[PDB]
Assembly symmetry: D2
Homo-oligomer: 46 residues x 4
């Protein structure tokens, strides 16, 4: 299962990253936020 969150002020981004990393740490799991390779989407003009 894949989960996605989209941020934009509302909620801070770094704080969010913290929270999620913490969640994993609290479950005994280590990891970091990796930047994904760029990707393209076909956008309809209308």
């Amino acid at each position: 299962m894949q989960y996605k969150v989209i941020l934009n002020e509302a909620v801070d981004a770094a704080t969010f990253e913290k929270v999620v990393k913490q969640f994993f740490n609290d479950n005994g799991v280590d990891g970091e936020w990796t930047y994904d390779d760029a990707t393209k989407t076909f956008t309809v003009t209308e």
Copy 2:
């Protein structure tokens, strides 16, 4: 590089799948359309 196309301006999906599969065949590549594990997105209630 990853490419993403989004359908639903109503266009036949089966035709699209076919056209693309064909395209790969023409370029000497075999493959099928496989399903991806679901993705949930956190949706703001607005």
Copy 3:
């Protein structure tokens, strides 16, 4: 900005709750909804 987390050890239900909770704490309410299915053209060789 877009964030992605993959699960599957670690309970999915609680993760959702924690995250939803996090947002409620920052004043924004929301729910986890499914995205419409995705198919990937899987190369054989």
Copy 4:
């Protein structure tokens, strides 16, 4: 429904984009290929 295609063999990325765009134009809908906003994935260290 969403479709995903990943490349880089003999299949050139430019022609794939064109074929897809062509497919849509042929169905009466115009559009262009745009780059997505950056995405970060929390990568487990094991």
